[PDB]
Amino acid sequence: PFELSGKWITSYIGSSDLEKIGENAPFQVFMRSIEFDDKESKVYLNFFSKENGICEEFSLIGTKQEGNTYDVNYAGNNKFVVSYASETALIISNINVDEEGDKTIMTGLLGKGTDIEDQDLEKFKEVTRENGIPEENIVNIIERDDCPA
Amino acid sequence: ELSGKWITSYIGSSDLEKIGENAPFQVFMRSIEFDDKESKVYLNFFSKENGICEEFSLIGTKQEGNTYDVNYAGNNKFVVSYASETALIISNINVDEEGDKTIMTGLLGKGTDIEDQDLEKFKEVTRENGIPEENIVNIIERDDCPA
Numbered sequence: 001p002f003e004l005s006g007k008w009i010t011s012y013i014g015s016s017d018l019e020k021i022g023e024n025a026p027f028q029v030f031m032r033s034i035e036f037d038d039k040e041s042k043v044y045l046n047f048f049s050k051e052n053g054i055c056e057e058f059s060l061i062g063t064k065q066e067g068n069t070y071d072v073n074y075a076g077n078n079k080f081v082v083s084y085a086s087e088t089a090l091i092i093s094n095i096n097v098d099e100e101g102d103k104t105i106m107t108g109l110l111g112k113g114t115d116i117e118d119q120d121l122e123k124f125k126e127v128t129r130e131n132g133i134p135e136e137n138i139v140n141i142i143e144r145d146d147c148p149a
Numbered sequence: 150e151l152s153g154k155w156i157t158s159y160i161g162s163s164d165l166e167k168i169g170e171n172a173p174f175q176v177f178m179r180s181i182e183f184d185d186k187e188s189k190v191y192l193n194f195f196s197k198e199n200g201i202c203e204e205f206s207l208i209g210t211k212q213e214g215n216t217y218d219v220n221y222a223g224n225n226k227f228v229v230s231y232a233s234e235t236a237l238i239i240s241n242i243n244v245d246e247e248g249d250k251t252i253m254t255g256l257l258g259k260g261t262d263i264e265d266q267d268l269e270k271f272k273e274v275t276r277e278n279g280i281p282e283e284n285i286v287n288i289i290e291r292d293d294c295p296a
Contacts, residue, residue, distance in 0.1 A: 001295050002204060066184055067191035068206040085204040119198060130220035 004082065005035045008090055008110040010047075010141045012121070014128035017104040020096070021139055024050045026075035027096070030145045031110050032057075034090070043070050048147035055147035075099075083127050088112060089120035091127055105131050114142050151232050154180045155257040157194075157292065159268070161275040161285040163252040167243075168286050171197055173222035174243070177292045178257055181237070190217050195294040202294035227253075230274050235259065236267035238274050252278045261289065 010031045013021055020027040028049065035044040041064040048055045062072030065079070072078045076098035084091035090110040097103050109124035111117075128138060157178045162168045168175050175196060182191040190209040195202045209219030212226075219225050223245035231238035237257035244250050256263075256271040275285065 002202075066187060067182060067189070067208060068193065069208075081208065082206055084206075086201065123203075126222075127220075130224075 002085055002087070004085055004090070006033065007112060008032070008034045009113060010145070011109045011111050011116055012124060012138055013109075013141055014107040014124075014131075014133045014138045015104060016106070016131070016133050016137070017102070018137060020075075020098075020104050020106070024052065026098075027104075027106060028139070028141065028144065029108070030055075030141060030147050031108075032149075034110075038064075043072070045072070048145075050147070057148075083107075084120075084123055086120065088117050089123075091120075091124050093127065093131065105133065107131060107133065116142075151229075151237065152182050154259070155237055156260065157288040158256040158258050158263050159271060159285055160256075160288050161254040161271075161278075161280050161282075163278070163280050163284065164249075165284050167251055167253070168284075168288075170291070171199065174251075174253060175286075175288070175291075176255070177202075177288065177294050178255075179296075181257070190219065192219065192221075197294070230254075231270055233267070235264055236270070238267075238271055240274065240278055252280055254278055254280060263289075 008031045010029055015021045015027065030048040032046045043062040045060045048057050060072055060074055062070045065071050068081050070080050076096045078094055078096050080092050080094040082090060083093045088111060092108045094106045107128045109120060155178050157176055160168045162174060173196060177195040180193040188211040192207040194205055196205060207219050207221055209217040212218055215228050216226055223243050225241055225243050227239050227241035229237060230240045239255045241253040242250065243253060254275045256267060272282065
């Protein structure tokens with residue numbers, strides 16, 4: 001029986017728009033935890049993000065929708081899905097439509113800490129590729145995560 | 150109401166090396182939801198690597214006819230060849246990285262039982278996709294993944 005809730009840190013993130021994941025951008029998200037409240041059809045996301053160089057913590061709440069989709073507001077409108085889940089990893093696929101109306105598909109490999117299992121990385125790279133996102137559009141987040149645990 | 154939980158029974162492939170153990174298409178279905186209003190399909194299942202189970206949640210979009218496009222270990226295009234209350238036969242065309250096309254078939258169920266007639270319709274749809282009877286593997290025998 002898989003436990004999806006608990007501690008989750010971001011390892012890598014891929015994006016179809018490089019403007020959304022660079023330094024201090026809205027989507028260079030350093031995850032800390034995700035909680036799935038299936039009874040109340042919600043999801044609780046806690047993470048850090050840099051703005052003007054300093055770490056800023058977030059606590060959002062998303063509502064479960066059609067299929068395995070999750071709706072959440074943050075730098076536009078998001079609809080994310082957990083494309084993969086194993087005892088060591090979680091791979092999220094997300095679609096953002098910012099305030100301007102531009103659509104960006106993103107992906108992320110989350111884990112239990114700073115130690116990556118290449119098996120989960122290959123799956124993450126395979127999902128990223130399927131979303132038509134190129135390898136040069138992948139950023140290592142563990143090397144950039146200097147925010148508080 | 151062809152929407153609900155569906156477990157894999159048998160799977161047949163034109164490349165036997167794809168449905169083998171620790172292989173990508175050795176899929177242990179859990180649920181399939183068909184959203185007609187929004188024109189989409191939702192697959193929820195497991196697979197295996199180094200003996201460990203891995204959950205997958207995919208989204209596919211309806212196309213011309215009854216074909217659906219969904220990404221998983223390459224680009225797929227499947228059809229629900231047959232659909233009754235006890236079974237769901239799926240024909241699938243997978244095109245991986247190398248561009249290596251593979252034809253597949255899957256018999257889905259509700260629990261542990263398999264009716265002789267659905268099993269039969271499955272073998273008939275299989276032979277119809279140009280797939281040898283040898284290339285059929287029993288998938289419920291090895292489904293020890295979580296419920």
